[PDB]
Amino acid sequence: MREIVHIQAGQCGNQIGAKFWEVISDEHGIDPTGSYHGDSDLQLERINVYYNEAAGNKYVPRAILVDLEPGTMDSVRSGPFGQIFRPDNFVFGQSGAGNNWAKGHYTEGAELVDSVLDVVRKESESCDCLQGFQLTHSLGGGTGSGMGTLLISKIREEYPDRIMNTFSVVPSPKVSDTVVEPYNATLSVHQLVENTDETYCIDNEALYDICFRTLKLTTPTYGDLNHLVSATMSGVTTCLRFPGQLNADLRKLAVNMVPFPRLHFFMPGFAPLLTVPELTQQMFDAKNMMAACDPRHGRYLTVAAVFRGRMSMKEVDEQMLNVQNKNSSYFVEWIPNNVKTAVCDIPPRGLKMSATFIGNSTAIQELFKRISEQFTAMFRRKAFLHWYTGEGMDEMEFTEAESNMNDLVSEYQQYQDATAD
Amino acid sequence: IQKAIEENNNFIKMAKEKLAQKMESNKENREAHLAAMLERLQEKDKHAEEVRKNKELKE
Amino acid sequence: MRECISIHVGQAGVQIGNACWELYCLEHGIQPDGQMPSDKTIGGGDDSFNTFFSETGAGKHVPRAVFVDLEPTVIDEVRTGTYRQLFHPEQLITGKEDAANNYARGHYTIGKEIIDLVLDRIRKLADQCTGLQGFLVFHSFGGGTGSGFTSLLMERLSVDYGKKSKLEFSIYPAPQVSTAVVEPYNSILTTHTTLEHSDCAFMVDNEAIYDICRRNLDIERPTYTNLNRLISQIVSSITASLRFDGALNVDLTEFQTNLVPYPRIHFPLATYAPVISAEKAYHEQLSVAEITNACFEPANQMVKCDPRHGKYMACCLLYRGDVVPKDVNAAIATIKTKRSIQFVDWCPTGFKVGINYQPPTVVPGGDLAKVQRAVCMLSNTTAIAEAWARLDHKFDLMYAKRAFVHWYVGEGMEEGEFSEAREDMAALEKDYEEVGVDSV
Numbered sequence: 001m002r003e004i005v006h007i008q009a010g011q012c013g014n015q016i017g018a019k020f021w022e023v024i025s026d027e028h029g030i031d032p033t034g035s036y037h038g039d040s041d042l043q044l045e046r047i048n049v050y051y052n053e054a055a056g057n058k059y060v061p062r063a064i065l066v067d068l069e070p071g072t073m074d075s076v077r078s079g080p081f082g083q084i085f086r087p088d089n090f091v092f093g094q095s096g097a098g099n100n101w102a103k104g105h106y107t108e109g110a111e112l113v114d115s116v117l118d119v120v121r122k123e124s125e126s127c128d129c130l131q132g133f134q135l136t137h138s139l140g141g142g143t144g145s146g147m148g149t150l151l152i153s154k155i156r157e158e159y160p161d162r163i164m165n166t167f168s169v170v171p172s173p174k175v176s177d178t179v180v181e182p183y184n185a186t187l188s189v190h191q192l193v194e195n196t197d198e199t200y201c202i203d204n205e206a207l208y209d210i211c212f213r214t215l216k217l218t219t220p221t222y223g224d225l226n227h228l229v230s231a232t233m234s235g236v237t238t239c240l241r242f243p244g245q246l247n248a249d250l251r252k253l254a255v256n257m258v259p260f261p262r263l264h265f266f267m268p269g270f271a272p273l274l275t276v277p278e279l280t281q282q283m284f285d286a287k288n289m290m291a292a293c294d295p296r297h298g299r300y301l302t303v304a305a306v307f308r309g310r311m312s313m314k315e316v317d318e319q320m321l322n323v324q325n326k327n328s329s330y331f332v333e334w335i336p337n338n339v340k341t342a343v344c345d346i347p348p349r350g351l352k353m354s355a356t357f358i359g360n361s362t363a364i365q366e367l368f369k370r371i372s373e374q375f376t377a378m379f380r381r382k383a384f385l386h387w388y389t390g391e392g393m394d395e396m397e398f399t400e401a402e403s404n405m406n407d408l409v410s411e412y413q414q415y416q417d418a419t420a421d
Numbered sequence: 422i423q424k425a426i427e428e429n430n431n432f433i434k435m436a437k438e439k440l441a442q443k444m445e446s447n448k449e450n451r452e453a454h455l456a457a458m459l460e461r462l463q464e465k466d467k468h469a470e471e472v473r474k475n476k477e478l479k480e
Numbered sequence: 481m482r483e484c485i486s487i488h489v490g491q492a493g494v495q496i497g498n499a500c501w502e503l504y505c506l507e508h509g510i511q512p513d514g515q516m517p518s519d520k521t522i523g524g525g526d527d528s529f530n531t532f533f534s535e536t537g538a539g540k541h542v543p544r545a546v547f548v549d550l551e552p553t554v555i556d557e558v559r560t561g562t563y564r565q566l567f568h569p570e571q572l573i574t575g576k577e578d579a580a581n582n583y584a585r586g587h588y589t590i591g592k593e594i595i596d597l598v599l600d601r602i603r604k605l606a607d608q609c610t611g612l613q614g615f616l617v618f619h620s621f622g623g624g625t626g627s628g629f630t631s632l633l634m635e636r637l638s639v640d641y642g643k644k645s646k647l648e649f650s651i652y653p654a655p656q657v658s659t660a661v662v663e664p665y666n667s668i669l670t671t672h673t674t675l676e677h678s679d680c681a682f683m684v685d686n687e688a689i690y691d692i693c694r695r696n697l698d699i700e701r702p703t704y705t706n707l708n709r710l711i712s713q714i715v716s717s718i719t720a721s722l723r724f725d726g727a728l729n730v731d732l733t734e735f736q737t738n739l740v741p742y743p744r745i746h747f748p749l750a751t752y753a754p755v756i757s758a759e760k761a762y763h764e765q766l767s768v769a770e771i772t773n774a775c776f777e778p779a780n781q782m783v784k785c786d787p788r789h790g791k792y793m794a795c796c797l798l799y800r801g802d803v804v805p806k807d808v809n810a811a812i813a814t815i816k817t818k819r820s821i822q823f824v825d826w827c828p829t830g831f832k833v834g835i836n837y838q839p840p841t842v843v844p845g846g847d848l849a850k851v852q853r854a855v856c857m858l859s860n861t862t863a864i865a866e867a868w869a870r871l872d873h874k875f876d877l878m879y880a881k882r883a884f885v886h887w888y889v890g891e892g893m894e895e896g897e898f899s900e901a902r903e904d905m906a907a908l909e910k911d912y913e914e915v916g917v918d919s920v
């Protein structure tokens with residue numbers, strides 16, 4: 001088949017990863033023992049994508065869950081569907097990373113990384129035809145940030161022709177007071193720009209503002225932010241996990257969404273937070289974007305949109321045409337037909353019809369500037385920099401990550417200002 | 422008739438040759454593209470060796 | 481003899497092949513098990529339908545066809561479908577990983593892994609032939625396999641079969657059903673590479689077929705299944721001259737003599753009528769004059785373009801069913817004095833006509849009305865270059881910024897191949913512009 005190998009690392013990567021598996025194990029009708037208890041052969045036609053079929057007919061996540069402190073993984077195996085995971089696929093350390101990137105990338109992560117790669121290999125070589133890998137992790141912490149991007153470099157060495165996607169969670173002072181986070185995020189980006197094909201920028205700055213202001217949840221738990229991410233994760237993988245008019249693997253979807261290799265950072269969205277017109281209206285609205293960026297401050301290079309639930313597909317076609325016509329200035333004119341739409345007739349749990357948004361917009365540079373602002377404020381003070389040179393790192397490695405990320409922003413601006421003539 | 426044979430043969434011939442250098446040039450380019458990618462990842466390995474190594478030269 | 485081997489490449493080629501061969505079986509009375517009760521010569525024959533069907537000693541009539549895709553899920557449905565018994569398993573060829581809408585993967589990276597096997601299987605069919613006439617190649621312009629692998633195959637067939645004729649049925653991309661933003665790139669790459677190796681190519685604009693299904697069969701949002709069943713009727717009309725015999729029958733090569741004035745000018749415009757739902761065909765017979773007029777109304781063309789703003793170099797009318805020359809001549813005379821038909825000054829203006837008696841057939845539960853007569857017009861018009869212009873412009877918009885080009889370079893291609901391909905298309909567009917200029 002075409003199987004994906006999933007990886008979750010760090011506090012954040014494991015928390016959002018667990019919820020990810022609860023939603024999609026739900027949809028495919030598989031209980032926390034692993035037995036199919038659905039009603040549709042449709043729930044199994046692409047079951048290979050995220051599951052191994054085991055003896056006694058039990059579907060097992062092709063998931064590798066990783067950390068540098070054992071606590072967070074104890075919760076997964078005790079949390080729902082914890083008994084469904086492959087027990088040997090638990091790869092934890094004991095000496096944590098302490099929200100330090102060098103610990104995750106060079107010193108502590110470097111020591112645990114090879115035993116993770118062994119688990120990757122065991123899962124990979126059993127696949128008929130592996131599409132590639134998907135990682136959940138944060139760029140603010142230490143394990144998901146530095147070891148997650150170290151593990152990406154190592155996988156791209158051993159699987160250099162496989163696709164590497166990530167749901168990377170960007171840090172915001174509105175959720176985690178931890179102060180060295182802009183240092184971590186900038187060093188991770190300097191990695192993801194080179195070694196990933198498709199990175200969804202999940203922004204806590206955003207996720208906070210949506211629970212606060214739309215769902216009206218003051219004091220929002222991480223379980224509230226993740227409830228949104230899990231709906232985004234389920235949406236963008238809906239085409240892969242079910243049979244529709246579109247039959248596209250990871251590479252084919254990256255091909256039609258990534259016009260330039262460095263510019264593979266997407267701002268996703270979800271709606272409702274209905275009628276096809278307002279569903280479409282909501283999802284292009286900036287208030288439904290999981291990245292703290294205004295699309296009407298830049299231009300779309302490409303856009304994917306995924307509707308779910310029974311609905312007139314003729315009306316969806318008319319309304320996507322409508323939005324493009326009314327918002328033509330915000331789609332670059334030198335990429336014809338750069339907005340593609342998919343419809344899955346299976347709706348999510350709870351919602352009769354929803355819409356998931358994937359946007360490759362030059363306005364994502366707004367994100368990369370917020371981080372770069374908080375980074376350069378700290379960097380020229382050298383605040384908490386001894387935590388990094390302690391692990392052996394060099395001032396120069398910081399400066400490159402800064403310049404390589406200032407380079408990325410200007411490149412987004414170059415194509416935002418380009419015209420057909 | 423001899424001219425027609427010669428012309429069917431040259432077309433078959435040049436098509437065989439044009440294709441063969443294309444497949445070779447494509448073989449060369451794709452290899453020189455993956456190798457360059459690997460070598461950036463191996464310079465990556467040394468660098469990380471120098472970071473673990475410098476830290477030991479710190480006590 | 482005069483066998484024709486059909487090669488279906490990629491999703492679009494394969495699924496259109498499914499539609500065509502099911503349609504052929506119904507036209508010839510062949511069952512899904514391959515048995516044909518009306519064929520009294522068991523194990524073989526020289527009948528007209530044997531140009532497309534071989535016979536096993538056990539009475540099975542087997543398509544002279546190969547199905548190829550770099551991915552198994554589409555051809556798997558052929559292996560488990562209603563007509564799975566019709567094909568020897570060696571006629572169905574699949575890799576594991578597809579071209580990912582990348583011409584380079586279809587032509588070089590993934591395609592080179594399976595091309596030798598494909599040619600081996602094609603040879604096995606050719607050795608069965610006593611008089612092989614040529615090949616019919618079905619593929620999309622947009623897919624990585626339909627574009628990249630097809631052109632690789634066409635180059636190889638020229639080497640292995642010389643100047644044995646090769647005809648194409650090519651699916652011209654339309655945004656209403658495209659899966660990909662890079663299809664303009666793949667379209668120009670394959671067209672450039674295949675141009676020297678194709679003797680005649682029938683382009684099918686998915687937008688033209690999409691609109692016809694919406695407007696004439698009143699399907700709100702047509703599917704590939706709706707499109708392919710209509711495409712089959714056009715393909716069937718074009719190949720009917722090879723699969724049936726009749727006194728009035730004119731054999732596709734004869735039409736080709738007229739349709740191709742220079743080797744590169746080999747893209748005929750097809751127009752088909754009547755396309756009509758069962759609701760509307762009830763108590764309304766479409767006459768010869770009525771279906772003939774429909775051929776000059778541009779909404780019925782396979783490719784969106786305006787022949788009324790271009791010039792004709794050839795006009796052929798392929799009738800099937802209840803039709804006699806008396807009716808045809810009257811209808812043509814009517815048209816010739818009322819329509820915008822301008823010929824280039826270096827061509828005769830007569831319309832070449834062929835008639836098959838065997839009436840049009842319809843698939844069970846299709847949306848087409850079963851009709852007593854149908855017509856397919858094949859015209860060589862300068863207007864078809866409008867299709868090249870639209871694609872060439874989409875190519876230009878993206879290539880100026882090299883959008884997506886890194887995907888092709890990463891699989892071994894160079895920017896030089898892109899510019900060389902686009903320069904060929906510019907010359908091709910200029911060739912169409914030259915043929916229409918008057919003489920001195």
Ligand SMILES: Nc1nc2c(ncn2[C@@H]2O[C@H](COP(=O)(O)OP(=O)(O)OP(=O)(O)O)[C@@H](O)[C@H]2O)c(=O)[nH]1
Nearest residue numbers: 010011012015098099138140141142143144176222
């Ligand atoms: N949305 C969301 N973000 C989380 C969650 N848990 C942690 N984070 C984010 O993660 C960032 C900090 O990184 P960590 O959570 O510590 O991840 P880590 O790299 O494993 O850090 P260690 O605990 O030292 O291993 C903060 O900015 C948080 O916003 C969660 O459950 N949901």
Ligand SMILES: Nc1nc2c(ncn2[C@@H]2O[C@H](COP(=O)(O)OP(=O)(O)OP(=O)(O)O)[C@@H](O)[C@H]2O)c(=O)[nH]1
Nearest residue numbers: 490491492578579580581620622623624625626704
């Ligand atoms: N008419 C028609 N067109 C189709 C059909 N299937 C796909 N297409 C068209 O083909 C184009 C994409 O190329 P595909 O044929 O799907 O791709 P492929 O040939 O399988 O090659 P890959 O990219 O490797 O998958 C799109 O523009 C579609 O409009 C079909 O069944 N009928």
Ligand SMILES: c1cc(CNc2cc3c(cn2)[nH]c2ccccc23)cc(Oc2ccc3c(c2)OCO3)c1
Nearest residue numbers: 020134135136165166167233236239253257304342
């Ligand atoms: C698999 C698929 C995708 C979706 N990518 C995509 C879709 C479409 C597209 C281009 N790309 N164009 C389209 C047109 C119509 C419809 C859909 C698309 C993303 C992904 O990344 C992750 C990474 C970490 C995760 C995760 C997913 O789930 C849990 O953790 C993995």
Ligand SMILES: [Ca+2]
Nearest residue numbers: 519521524525
């Ligand atoms: Ca016989």
Ligand SMILES: [Mg+2]
Nearest residue numbers: 010011069072
């Ligand atoms: Mg932790």
Ligand SMILES: [Mg+2]
Nearest residue numbers: 490491551578
């Ligand atoms: Mg395919």
